[PDB]
């Protein structure tokens, strides 16, 4: 019971670093380029690993030269990949990512291949006893709500001493996913989802959405340079200022760095206030670097 | 493997990986969107000409810079997919194998391009010194780093100096970007290709204006060639006679990307087969026009 598990996408991020965002129908030359392992649950595994937390990724992956790269990266980072749902149909997805080196803005064109999502069945097939935490990136909702019911069940039959804690990310403003607010002890909702839904602050959002969460759970909302807020059952709003770097050069996967770091801190039994601060602290540190090398 | 003496046509230039995404609307900065479709394509002038020469039935080799890595691995597998010999590649210990990102707006046609970075060092004159030339019957050079490429051309001139004219290596040059450095390249090669774009920048309004206006810059006996899209192509040799062929536009135009490279390679092929400039011009125009109605190079046959 010593590992954290993330369940979501792994994506090849084909990255271009430019010094200003290109105007439509124009042509500019990038400063530098790199390939990076990406996808939300993949990114959080990078971060959890860098923090010293044994973790494991679980997502789909079609065999090929791309996947061979993604996997060589998972190892080397020490991410247990042994839970991957290897596909036959489809290619592994990839993104074009334009990173604006003057403000770290990152723009992403995702080629979501037909590759099929990890399912209730893939999941029903995993040894829950290895994990202290399970984080799920909201993608195939209805099919994941099932993986969530399974974990609750396993919990029921377990001494509070050894229940598996669960967190859930709703990053995309998409209906299918809104049912997912109802699971997990921790629920991450993005600024985009919040805005796409009426609210224009992290505190508004938390008041609004708290009704939708499972009894006793914490709802977390980061808001970039506004920092991040949390709201638990006690009804007290928690806040943390951001730790922006002097020069913000790369925000690609800052949100995932925040999620990972919050998860990490909580899994070490720190308070919600402490973990809020940790998340901003580490996400902010990453925004001042290209990639993840160097956040520790 | 063993390459027979004087059998291959060599093309020296750029190879680049083009990632091409088609989208609903141009992405607003800091957004996360889905393309309609995405394609990884081997690109570059000397690179495309190599593809075309293989499809035409010529043994061809590519010389360009690459750095070891997954991008290079993809480009090399694609080269090989098109029957192109890649053993002359100049492998580099520093820099990125070129890769470009292109975003095609589906609701209006616009292409927005992020060009490859400048990290990888071009093929040098000393890189090229190491090449045994006897395998080649023709050598074509995409103009890039002209001061260095001039030395390569001087080397071939030296080589040729000492051969029966039946084993002299024919040489062609392409000046396609309108930048001053390249213009000294006009002075080299038996066949000089100048692009419509370059000609326009020098202030010429037609293939005829450009050939007459620039022929001064070529070496005694050279042929200067200019293609002008749907106005066809002209050539102008040492005898002063402006040759011309009309375009062979396709039923409907589908993909013009790399049609100039298809023209260059077709002309080169034709000439290398001992056809006359007028026949080369015409052939070049046919294959290029066909390619324009085709997605990629598959059916140019
Ligand atoms: O806390 C954050 C979460 C996501 N993005 C950013 C960017 C600067 S701080 C920060």
Swiss-Prot record, chain A:
Matching entries from InterPro entries are given as: Ketohexokinase-related, KHK, PfkB_dom, Ribokinase-like
The gene designation is KHK
GO molecular function (one): ATP binding
- What controls its activity? Requires potassium. Inhibition by ADP.
Q: What clinical condition does the entry mention?
A: Fructosuria: Benign defect of intermediary metabolism.
Alphabetical keyword list: ATP-binding, Carbohydrate metabolism, Disease variant, Kinase, Nucleotide-binding, Transferase
Quickly give the catalysed reaction. beta-D-fructose + ATP = beta-D-fructose 1-phosphate + ADP + H(+)
**Record EC number:** 2.7.1.3
According to its UniProt record, which protein family does this protein belong to?
Belongs to the carbohydrate kinase PfkB family.
Q: Which EC class does it fall in?
A: transferase
Q: Tell me the residue numbers annotated for binding ATP.
A: 106, 224-227, 253-256
Name the pathway: Carbohydrate metabolism; fructose metabolism
This protein's assembly is summarised as:
Homodimer.
On tissue specificity, the annotation reads: Most abundant in liver, kidney, gut, spleen and pancreas. Low levels also found in adrenal, muscle, brain and eye.
- Pfam families, A to Z: PfkB
Q: What does this protein do?
A: Catalyzes the phosphorylation of the ketose sugar fructose to fructose-1-phosphate.
Organism in which the protein naturally occurs:
Homo sapiens
Query: GO terms for CC?
Result: cytoplasm; cytosol; extracellular exosome
- The record lists beta-D-fructose as bound by 13, 39-40, 43, 256
Q: What name goes with this protein?
A: Ketohexokinase
The record lists the effect of residue 41 to T as: In FRUCT; no effect on ketohexokinase function; decreases enzyme activity but no effect in substrate affinity; decreases thermal stability
Biological process (GO) annotations held by this record are: fructose metabolic process; regulation of glycogen metabolic process; response to fructose; response to glucose; response to insulin; response to sucrose; response to zinc ion
